[PDB]
């Protein structure tokens, strides 16, 4: 079978890459779109591993209808785990 | 970095194996949970590449609350997630 924990880590990896690129890049329009998609789908805002960048993402209107922390309760890494572990 | 394609393939494949386990394996508790979690989250039911079993999983109440299963392809929902439309 497909390796569970490796796929969950790849998706976090991928999300992190988008989240960073959303703020640091010369407007990666897709990176911003992707990052909204995740937040809405997972009811989510940022990462605990990227709490500096998550702040500015929050204020750029890429999170579900909340202000700063909060944030530590809105970790996407944890919602990604829960998706692959059959919770929610 | 990680490529969008290979990760989007992996996740479909992970789901597909959950969809199968939920039906063919008897006790498969986690497989059912995983399957419903995906359906609830992504808003979809089953897969085009598993249309027969999807019939069963719809009928086991593991989907959101039959003719229109083709419109609820849950593989597409996964692509939309990683591409950024959803």
């Amino acid at each position, epitope marked *: 079978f497909v390796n569970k924990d490796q796929i969950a880590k790849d998706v976090k990896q991928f999300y992190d890459q988008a989240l960073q690129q959303a703020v640091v890049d010369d407007d990666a329009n897709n990176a911003k779109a992707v990052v909204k998609t995740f937040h809405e789908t997972l009811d989510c805002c940022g990462s605990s591993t990227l709490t500096a960048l998550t702040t500015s993402v929050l204020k750029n209107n890429l999170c579900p209808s909340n202000i700063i922390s909060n944030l530590f309760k809105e970790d996407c890494h944890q919602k990604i785990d829960d998706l692959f572990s059959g919770k929610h | 970095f990680v490529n969008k394609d290979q990760i989007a393939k992996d996740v479909k494949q992970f789901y597909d194996q959950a969809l*199968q*386990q939920a*039906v*063919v394996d008897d006790d498969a508790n986690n497989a059912k949970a995983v399957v419903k979690t995906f359906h609830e989250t992504l808003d979809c039911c089953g897969s085009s590449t598993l249309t*027969a*079993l999807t019939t*069963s999983v719809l*009928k*086991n109440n593991l989907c959101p609350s*039959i003719s229109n299963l083709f419109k609820e392809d849950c593989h597409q929902k996964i692509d939309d997630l990683f591409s950024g439309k959803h």
Partner: antibody, heavy 120, light 112 residues
Framework: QVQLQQSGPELVKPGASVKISCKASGYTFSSSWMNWVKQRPGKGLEWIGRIYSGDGDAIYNGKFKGKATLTADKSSSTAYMQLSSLTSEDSAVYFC?????????????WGQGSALTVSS | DIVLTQSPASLSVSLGQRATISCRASKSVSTSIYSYMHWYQQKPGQPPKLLIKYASYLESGVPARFSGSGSGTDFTLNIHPVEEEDAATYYC?????????FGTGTKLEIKR
């Protein structure tokens, strides 16, 4: 003990209809699928379709789509199968078989069959 | 539709001996984790009985002398050692997609 007792043999005139029946016991009919398979004398097995007893939703083999008609009856715990415009080569034994508790997609318990023979 | 070509059409096998039937699918019947091919036995005048499920798994209450193997399009069924009660027609069936279809059929004769 799971058993599926089927309707007796039947002689019917060409161009008529027959409603064969398959009564289920010893398992929860209401949330189970029931399949139907055709077998002509001295020949193989042909799958007709399967119906979900909980709400009568049925998936037909394209070959039997407009001819076969599956229906479920929870109270009786009975699946029915109806064939229109009967022809000499609808003569055959017709089986019913249940799937597992999930939708196994596998024919786990079979009735004895029903000998339908079409002749004027 | 998936076309199941069983072979041989029939075979005669002495008691105590091995009998191998094969089934070949027109396209693949396997996913990453499951081969959706099953074997049925039909004694005349009776309904068929499921013997092997998902290529290799013994349906409960079936002698271990029945075994199955294969993947993709190529599937084999082995009975060993053959017995009198194994006189029947053997059918392979896929459940990969709609419509379900059955194999051409293989008739086992028991040499005594």
């Amino acid at each position: 003990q799971v058993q599926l007792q089927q309707s007796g043999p039947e002689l019917v005139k060409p161009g008529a209809s027959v409603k064969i029946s398959c009564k289920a016991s010893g398992y929860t009919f209401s949330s189970s699928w029931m399949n139907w398979v055709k077998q002509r004398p001295g020949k193989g097995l042909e799958w007709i379709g399967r119906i979900y007893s909980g709400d009568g939703d049925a998936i037909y083999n394209g070959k039997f789509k407009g001819k076969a008609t599956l229906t479920a009856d929870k109270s009786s715990s009975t699946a029915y199968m109806q064939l229109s415009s009967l022809t000499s080569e609808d003569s055959a034994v017709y089986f019913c078989a249940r799937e597992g508790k999930t939708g196994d997609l596998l024919l786990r318990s079979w009735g004895q069959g029903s000998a339908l023979t079409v002749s004027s | 539709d998936i076309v199941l070509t069983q072979s041989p059409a029939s075979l005669s096998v002495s008691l105590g001996q091995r009998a191998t039937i094969s089934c070949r699918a027109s396209k693949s019947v396997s996913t990453s984790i499951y081969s959706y091919m099953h074997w049925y036995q039909q004694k005349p005048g009776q309904p068929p009985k499921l013997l092997i499920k998902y290529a290799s798994y013994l349906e409960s209450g079936v002698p271990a002398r029945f075994s199955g193997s294969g993947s993709g399009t190529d599937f084999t069924l082995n009975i060993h050692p053959v017995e009198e009660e194994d006189a029947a027609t053997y059918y392979c069936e896929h459940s990969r997609e709609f419509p379900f279809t059955f194999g051409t059929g293989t008739k086992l004769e028991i040499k005594r």
